[PDB]
Symmetry: C2
Subunit: 296 residues, 2 copies
C-alpha cells in the first residue's frame, strides 16, 4: 500500500498517493530552501496510533515559522486535526503495530524567483506519515558510534529549517565512518549532531550545552530535564569542551526518531568501557514510562 | 507567452510550460536544500541571444557539484547545448531585444527521506530562461543603497548552494531598509552580499577580499581583475575592515544580474560625496567592452 500524503499549494489542498504529489518548480522550498519543518513521533499500540509531545512540536513549528516571517497557516487544533487525518489515511499503508513519523514542512510558497520575501506569499504545506523504525534492541544494548567534526553550519541553528545541505554533509560524513551521527564542535565546545542533541554524563551528573543559536532546542531537551529529575539525576547545563566529551562516562543522543540512545564509541575509541551506562539505562526506562503515561 | 522550462527527474526529461513543471515532493532539493545552482546572463541583440562567460559559469557549476558529491550529468558541450535549446525555446516568451538569465539547478534527486546520500541517486536538473532587467540608467547614475549586517551564514560559502534561507533573510533585510543589498561582515571584515560580491576603492586602488570559504568566488572576480588591468587600475586583494568600508572612496557590487554597480549610500549615509566615482565609471565601460568583445 502506497503512502498517502498531504499537500497544500497556493491554498489548494489534497490528500493523494505519494507518487502523485508534486510541487511547482518555483516553490521557494525547492529554489531557496526557504521553509521549516517538524518530525513528530507517532506510536502504535495495535491499530491505535498516538502522537508523542505533539503540543511541544507544534509550539516549535510556530517558533520556526515566526523566526523566518511565515504566517502560521493553522491554529494548534487545526494542526492536530491535519496530523490525525493524515495518520488515519495511512492506517493501511503502515499496518497495525507500526510506529510512524509525521513529517511537516512549510515553505514560503511559489513566486517569481527573487531572494526577498514575495508580496502576499501563500505558504506551501507538505505532510507525510511514514514508518518509524526505532533504534533496535541491539543498538540499545551495544550503543552506537559517533564521529566528531568542526561545526561549519550557519548561526541560526535555533530555526528547524529545510536549508539542510550542511546537515546532509555531516550525516553523510557519519555514514562514511560507520557512525550513527556526527557530533559537531564549535570553538572547541560541543554543539549538536546533524539531527540530534548531545548529552554527556560525568561522575553521575547529566550535562548538556546551554540553549543558544548554535543548537536547536530539541523537544527532548525539556523532556530529558523532566526524566532526570524523576530519576534523581543531577542535570547541569554547561559548555562541554572536546576533552570533556572524550573523557565522558557516558555520551547520549536524543531526537524524535532516536528517543534516547547511548553512544559507546567516539571516533573509533570506546567511551569508558564501551558499554551503555546506568544513566542511559535509567533515562531510557523513564522515557518509556513517559510514553506510556502521556499517550495511554 | 508562458515561459518554457527544462526539467529532468529520475532520468526523465521534458521541456514544458512553466505552469506544468512540478517536482516530486521527496526531491532532496525540496526536503533538504540539497543542490547547487548557476545564474548565467544571456544578452540580446535583436533576436540574437548569447551567453556571457558561460564557460566560467559551467566550471563553477562543476566545482559546486563536486564539493557536495553530485556527479555532473553533462559534459560542457552538453550543458551548452541544453542552455541553447532552452533559450531558443523561449524566444517568443522573451521577445526580441530582451536580455535573459538562465537559471540552472541540480539536486541530489528523489529518495526516501534520510539525511545521508541515498544509494544510486539520480540528480534532478531544472533550468529556466527568464527576462533579465539590468540595473537602470538611473541606478547607474545615482548608485544604490546598501546596509550592513553580521554574517551569520554557514562556512561553506564557496559552494553556490540552494540552501539559501540565510541569504533570503539578508535580502529581505535589505528590502526592508530600502536597500539593494546587505553587505555582510564577519569578525569585523567584509565578506559579501546576499547574492553579490563586494569591492571598495581607496586612493585610486580597487580592493576586494581574498578568495575563501566565507565568500563565493563570483564569475566577476576574474573578470573584474581583467578589467582593472585593462584600465590601469591597481587591484589589491586584502581584508577590508568595517572602518575601511565606511571610509571608502567608492563601494561596488558585482553579480551576473548586476554587472558592476556603484554603491553610493551605506546604512543611510552617503559614500564619499554620494555619487558614483571614476573607478566605477571606468570598470563599467570596460565591462560593456568585454560583453561586446566576447559575444559579438
Amino acid at each position: 500500500i502506497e503512502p498517502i500524503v498531504y499537500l497544500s499549494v497556493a491554498s489548494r489542498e489534497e490528500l493523494v498517493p505519494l507518487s502523485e504529489a508534486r510541487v511547482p518548480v518555483l516553490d521557494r522550498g525547492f529554489i531557496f530552501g526557504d521553509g521549516v519543518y517538524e518530525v513528530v513521533p507517532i506510536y502504535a499500540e495495535g491499530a491505535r496510533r498516538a502522537p508523542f509531545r505533539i503540543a511541544q512540536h507544534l509550539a516549535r513549528l510556530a517558533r520556526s515559522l515566526k523566526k523566518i516571517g511565515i504566517a502560521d497557516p493553522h491554529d494548534e487544533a487545526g494542526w492536530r486535526a491535519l496530523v490525525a487525518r493524515l495518520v488515519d489515511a495511512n492506517a493501511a499503508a503502515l499496518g497495525d503495530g507500526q510506529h510512524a513519523i509525521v513529517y511537516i514542512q512549510v515553505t514560503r510558497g511559489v513566486a517569481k524567483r527573487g531572494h526577498a520575501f514575495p508580496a502576499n506569499a501563500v505558504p506551501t504545506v507538505f505532510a507525510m506519515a511514514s514508518p518509524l523504525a526505532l533504534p533496535t534492541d541491539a543498538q540499545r544494548a551495544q550503543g552506537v558510534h559517533c564521529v566528531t567534526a568542526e561545526d561549519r553550519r550557519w548561526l541560526h541553528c535555533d530555526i528547524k529549517s529545510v536549508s539542510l545541505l550542511g546537515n546532509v554533509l555531516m550525516a553523510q560524513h557519519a555514514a562514511e565512518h560507520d557512525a550513527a551521527e556526527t557530533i559537531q564542535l564549535r570553538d572547541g565546545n560541543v554543539t549538536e549532531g546533524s539531527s540530534s542533541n548531545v548529552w554527556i554524563v560525568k561522575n553521575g551528573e547529566l550535562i548538556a550545552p546551554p540553549r543558544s543559536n548554535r543548537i536547536l532546542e530539541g523537544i527532548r531537551y525539556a523532556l530529558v530535564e523532566e526524566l532526570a529529575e524523576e530519576c534523581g539525576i543531577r542535570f547541569v547545563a554547561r559548555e562541554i569542551n572536546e576533552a570533556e566529551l572524550r573523557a565522558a562516562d557516558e555520551i547520549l543522543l536524543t531526537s524524535a526518531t532516536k528517543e534516547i540512545l547511548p553512544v559507546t564509541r567516539l571516533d573509533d575509541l570506546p567511551v569508558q568501557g564501551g558499554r551503555p551506562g546506568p544513566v542511559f539505562d535509567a533515562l531510557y526506562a523513564a522515557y518509556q514510562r513517559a510514553k506510556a503515561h502521556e499517550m495511554e
